């Protein structure tokens, strides 16, 4: 009898999409019915709605009467999935067949009551790195061990068995201990250890030390005590879009000649930074494609209105400007792309490595500042500015230099060849026999034992 698995998605595409990918992986490879309780580029269940993949909508509660302007995104996203858990309660109460296992998103951990009530096998998804996970867990200890803000720390934080996290590479919920988002994060870290397992969007080669720290380190296993499932790198699969001007232009460009630039669906620069980045791209004398959003200094505008005067005119031959959105996976896969300036968001990161593309780390929010150091210091597949671009403007001199490096210098060629090897490792973990294929089959096992 085919297993029935429910998956729960936090709001947004950066949360919904992974969930979908995950679902498709499972269902394609092992034969499992996938229901999703979500709270020309995609088309969701294209033909996947043959009692195979099925998306039930449940995104219904306002929080306007409970937040303010300064309330941080993490807390907001924690609230949304709380206001009316009852909705979810009754949703699962009205499932004609209860699932044999439920897999909730990182921000839908507060659903334990329900999972316990219907007595279903409950699992959590961590859509980013294991290192960030290890932190999220161990933060329940630091909370006490360190007195004062974490950015004030003179020495790094050393998570048992894991690399040392500097005061500059902290995750955002640790920037302010006097906000609520910190408390939520420690609560999160405490919640993980109640689930029957933890899926993580990574593989062995990429994070061997960290994964084997979570699994085996005594100090961590006195907190964790649950299995861990490195199932990644899970990513959207390259779609087909005949008409896609970006592509049509890229088809005229040489192999690995282009640098792609896009800061993900959350990212937004400030006006000056955008001007310096423009002049940087101009002065580099390198070919590029740039997904530009309106510049928030906290702005619906035409492309000319927010970019430097004559920029588009001058760069007409050297670059392609793309307002708002560009189809990210398809560009990343394309032969003429040999570079990616990114916000270090894990989804995008994964998409880059899986195509063997070197990166320029430009962290902005979330955990991205922590992922940047991991890419650069440890993995050597990315470079970054001298000062993190959150703390200080990155002017056109350092930008120019950083561009020329990645693309045409021999060191640039070393970093690319590194990304390529990590692409292979990804294609080895995912393959029929790899660590992540097998690790999935361990999750399968564990859902049948329950």
Residue numbers in the entry: 4 to 42, 53 to 311, 324 to 475
Task: Reproduce the article's own wording on this structure.
However, since the addition of apocarotenoids increased the H/D exchange in H124, these effectors reverse the helix-forming effect of scopoletin and the corresponding H2 amino acids should therefore remain flexible. (Apo)carotenoids play a role as placeholders.
NbUGT72AY1 is a promiscuous transferase that glycosylates bioactive hydroxycoumarins such as scopoletin and umbelliferone, as well as monolignols involved in lignin formation and various other small molecules. Five distinct GT protein folds have been identified that are capable of GT activity (termed GT-A to GT-E).
